[PDB]
Amino acid sequence: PDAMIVIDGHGIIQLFSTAAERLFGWSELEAIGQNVNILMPEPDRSRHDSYISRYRTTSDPHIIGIGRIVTGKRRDGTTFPMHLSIGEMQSGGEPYFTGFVRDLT
Amino acid sequence: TIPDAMIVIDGHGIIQLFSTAAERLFGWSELEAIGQNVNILMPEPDRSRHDSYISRYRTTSDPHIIGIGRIVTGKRRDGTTFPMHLSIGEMQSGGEPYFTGFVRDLT
Amino acid sequence: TIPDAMIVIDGHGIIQLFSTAAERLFGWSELEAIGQNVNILMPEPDRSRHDSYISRYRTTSDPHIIGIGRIVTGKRRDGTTFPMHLSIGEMQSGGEPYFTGFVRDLT
Amino acid sequence: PDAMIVIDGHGIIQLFSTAAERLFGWSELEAIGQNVNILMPEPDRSRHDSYISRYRTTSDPHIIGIGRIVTGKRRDGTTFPMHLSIGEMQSGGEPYFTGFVRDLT
Ligand code: HEM
Ligand code: HEM
Ligand code: HEM
Ligand code: HEM
Ligand SMILES: [Cl-]
Ligand SMILES: [Cl-]
Ligand code: NA
């Protein structure tokens, strides 16, 4: 599952793999530091922080360990179907989330 | 923060993804690392034992490093070793387990 | 097992030698390539960063690609891009650094 | 454009540049797979494997990074003064050497 993205518990991109660069069009340096919400169209884009926040409060997963086909958005605005799997992991008493993204095109 | 040296293995210890920073630290490119057992990145005897670490974790769900991390010793392609902090997370994709390893070089 | 596409640059990224298999792959004759910056064989953002990559190496002696290797994107004369594996070595001749890059087309 | 030859850790020619063809007379096809010692007169020709082996053993260079004027031998039997510079390269976990050959004639 080629394109990999790691975010912190606020949605901020920490790692952005070479497959993610080719899929999403953002260079790794550009993507790191940006909110992962840049990688999706509305309505998900404006809602994404809520999804993270809701998970952190509730611990109730919806995509983590479940996976879902969703719409992603390339740097150039174009949208594409993709499968999303997500994992969690802790470092320093903070969570980080790893996403694997499959371009269904 | 989280290290940028990241390694993804499947539930058989086979490297699936090997980040640029991991390439640099271990001295393998992803081209050569993908498909090899992650045990190539460590000295003996951990190397000979590592498949059992993974396999027994899968049957017991008793983690040792997962979620807490540990200072271990890594081995580069050229056989040189280094102290490293290892962080491991677990995930599921397509109903299969994968583990995400983050490595910080302590040289 | 070493690629037959081989490029040699000086310590300022300027192409010194361009093997026949580099010519095929990148679409430049050795005659046009020599004297140009190696950055012509790559897309942005690496292209406008490449001099800095070379100079950072000359400063730190800590390689990113030398002795490790990397999959990157190369760019042909015609503007089309391709996946490639890059290996790089360092040598010295007449007291100046030169870099020998070997390119494997991953298409 | 100077002549360029790549050999492996046992002195076997892996690449032989157009200028090396023009200079030494051997086509790249003919040169690849032969020992680099084909390109020199005696006694270097007989001793050359031992030069490579000592370098691999000791790491004490004599020409690598140093350069020397030596004599080179053409496919057609004739010899010629030449300057030699040698680099080391690792690819796929194994040593290669790159040689640059300046014809002094
Ligand atoms: C780029 C396309 C993405 C889309 C369209 C998307 C969409 C979604 C949606 C709809 C949810 C909420 C599920 C629900 O309430 O039904 C969600 C939750 C979440 N997403 Fe994203 N996401 C994307 C990328 C990512 C990536 C790449 C990561 C990690 C690096 C990530 C991390 C999370 C996390 C941690 C949650 C909360 C956990 C959960 O609800 O299971 N997302 N995402
Ligand atoms: C390269 C240097 C590494 C060394 C020296 C090393 C060593 C170890 C050791 C000694 C254990 C057993 C812990 C114990 O039983 O006390 C362990 C467990 C484990 N390691 Fe490795 N490891 C390394 C890299 C990695 C990486 C990069 C990953 C994932 C990509 C990984 C995945 C695992 C997993 C899944 C377990 C079982 C989970 C656990 O016990 O918490 N290892 N490792
Ligand atoms: C044509 C496609 C190429 C690309 C896309 C490329 C890109 C890069 C990148 C990404 C780095 C590391 C920068 C970093 O991670 O900070 C690098 C370093 C370097 N590259 Fe290039 N390169 C290419 C071709 C070559 C060639 C053919 C040579 C030699 C003839 C070369 C010589 C070097 C040197 C000397 C370094 C610094 C040494 C090091 O850090 O290991 N490049 N290059
Ligand atoms: C064609 C004419 C050549 C001659 C006469 C020649 C001669 C020599 C000599 C005399 C030495 C040993 C230094 C000493 O102990 O005095 C040497 C070492 C070596 N030569 Fe050659 N060589 C030739 C071509 C090449 C080429 C084209 C390569 C690489 C492609 C090469 C690779 C080496 C290597 C790797 C060593 C060991 C490194 C060292 O001692 O510095 N040689 N060669
Ligand atoms: Cl999944
Ligand atoms: Cl020299
Ligand atoms: Na950034």
| Phi, psi values for residue C106, rounded to 5° | -95, 10
| Summary count for chain A: helices (H), strands (E) | 3, 5
Q: In 10 A of CB A48, how many CB atoms?
A: 18
DSSP-derived 3-state class of residue A72 = strand
Resolution in Å equals 1.8
Confirm if C65 and B21 have CB atoms less than 8 A apart.
Answer: no
Chain C interface residues facing chain D, Cβ-Cβ under 8 Å? 1-4, 6, 8, 16-17, 19-20, 30, 34, 67, 69, 87-94, 98, 100, 102
- Asked if D84 contacts D71 with a C-beta cutoff of 8 angstroms, the reply is no
DSSP secondary structure letter of residue D66:
T
Q: What is the DSSP letter of D93?
A: T
* Long-range contact set of residues C76-82: C-beta below 8 Å, sequence gap at least 24: C76/C25, C76/C26, C76/C27, C77/C26, C77/C27, C77/C28, C78/C27, C81/C43, C82/C25, C82/C106, C82/C107
DSSP for residue C41:
G
- Subunit partners of chain B (3 or more CB pairs within 8 A): A, C, D
The answer to the question of whether A10 is labelled as a binding residue is: no
> What distance in Å separates the CA atoms of residue B24 and residue B105, rounded to the nearest whole number?
11
Q: How far apart are CA B73 and CA B51, in angstroms?
A: 17
Q: Which residues of C touch B20 (CB under 8 A)?
A: 70
Residues of chain B that touch chain C, judged by Cβ-Cβ distance less than 8 Å: 20, 23-24, 27-32, 77-78
Task: Take residue A4 and report the two structure tokens written for it.
Answer: 């990999």
B106 token code pair: 């302590």
Q: Which of D55, D56, D80 is nearest to D66 (CA)?
A: D55
CB-based neighbours (< 5 A) of ligand 7, an ion: A 32-33
C104 close to C85: Cβ distance less than 8 angstroms: yes
Query: Which residue segment(s) compose the domain that A98 sits in?
Result: 1-105
Whether A33 and A12 have beta carbons less than 8 Å apart is answered as yes
Q: What is the rounded CA–CA span in Å between residue D33 and residue D8?
A: 10
Q: Which helix (H) or strand (E) holds B26?
A: helix B20-26
Which among A91, A84, A11, A100 is positioned nearest to A54, based on CA atoms?
A11
Tokens read off for C2 = 């070493």
Q: One-letter amino acid identity for C105?
A: D
Task: State how far the Cα of D10 lies from the Cα of D25, in Å rounded to an integer.
Answer: 22
**Is the separation of the CB atoms in A96 and A8 below 8 Å?**
yes
Chain C environment of D12 (Cβ under 8 Å): none
Alpha-carbon span C5 to B44, nearest angstrom: 37
Pairing of strands C70-75, B5-10: unpaired
The number of folded domains in chain C is 1
CA distance D68 to A50: 69
Q: Which of C70, C86, C90, C96 to mutate to test the pocket of ligand 3 (most atoms within 8 A of CB)?
A: C86
User: In the numeric block, which tokens belong to residue C54?
Assistant: 């070379």
At D90, list the tokens: 């690792």
Q: Is B11:B54 a contact under the CB 8 Å cutoff?
A: yes
Q: How many residues does chain D have?
A: 105
Which of the listed residues A53, A69, A86, A90 should we mutate to test ligand 1's pocket, taking the one with most ligand atoms within 8 A of CB? A86
**CATH number of domain containing A39:** 3.30.450.20
Peptide bond before D43: cis, by omega within 30 degrees of 0?
yes
Closest listed residue to residue C12, CA positions, set C88, C97, C83: C97
Assess contact for A104 and A81: CB atoms under 8 A: yes
Distance spanning both ends of chain D, measured CA to CA: 15
- Tell if the CB–CB gap between B69 and A91 is shorter than 8 Å: yes
- Among B43, B52, B23, B50, smallest CA distance to B83 is for B43
d(CA C67, CA D89): 7
Residue with tokens 């950072």: C56
One-letter amino acid at D76 equals D
Measured between CB atoms, which of C17, C90, C92 is closest to D1?
C17
Q: For chain D, count helices (H), then strands (E).
A: 3, 5
